[PDB]
Amino acid sequence: SMEQVAMELRLTELTRLLRSVLDQLQDKDPARIFAQPVSLKEVPDYLDHIKHPMDFATMRKRLEAQGYKNLHEFEEDFDLIIDNCMKYNARDTVFYRAAVRLRDQGGVVLRQARREVDSIG
Numbered sequence: 600s601m602e603q604v605a606m607e608l609r610l611t612e613l614t615r616l617l618r619s620v621l622d623q624l625q626d627k628d629p630a631r632i633f634a635q636p637v638s639l640k641e642v643p644d645y646l647d648h649i650k651h652p653m654d655f656a657t658m659r660k661r662l663e664a665q666g667y668k669n670l671h672e673f674e675e676d677f678d679l680i681i682d683n684c685m686k687y688n689a690r691d692t693v694f695y696r697a698a699v700r701l702r703d704q705g706g707v708v709l710r711q712a713r714r715e716v717d718s719i720g
Contacts, residue, residue: 648686
């Protein structure tokens with residue numbers, strides 16, 4: 600149907616906008632602490648601690664399969680990156696502090712993205 604295609608064009612445009620959002624958030628992690636999944640080889644107990652791991656590469660695969668239906672879903676995954684890190688690592692660690700900084704800096708980007716998603720439909 601023509602409706603199905605119009606829907607698909609909106610998903611595609613959302614995917615375009617989320618890709619740019621993703622790039623901007625990832626620039627706020629110049630150390631690449633959140634680039635890749637936590638290694639189960641190097642942290643064998645990780646899944647005893649963290650039930651839903653997340654990282655920027657895993658978000659990027661979902662993105663390019665057009666697997667985010669709305670900004671809320673995308674934000675949930677971004678928040679997992681931050682929240683997982685702040686639970687697993689202590690406050691006095693480079694990792695915890697990197698999450699805080701990403702959260703604070705990401706807030707600005709996400710604030711405007713929400714306006715753009717509402718605005719452009």
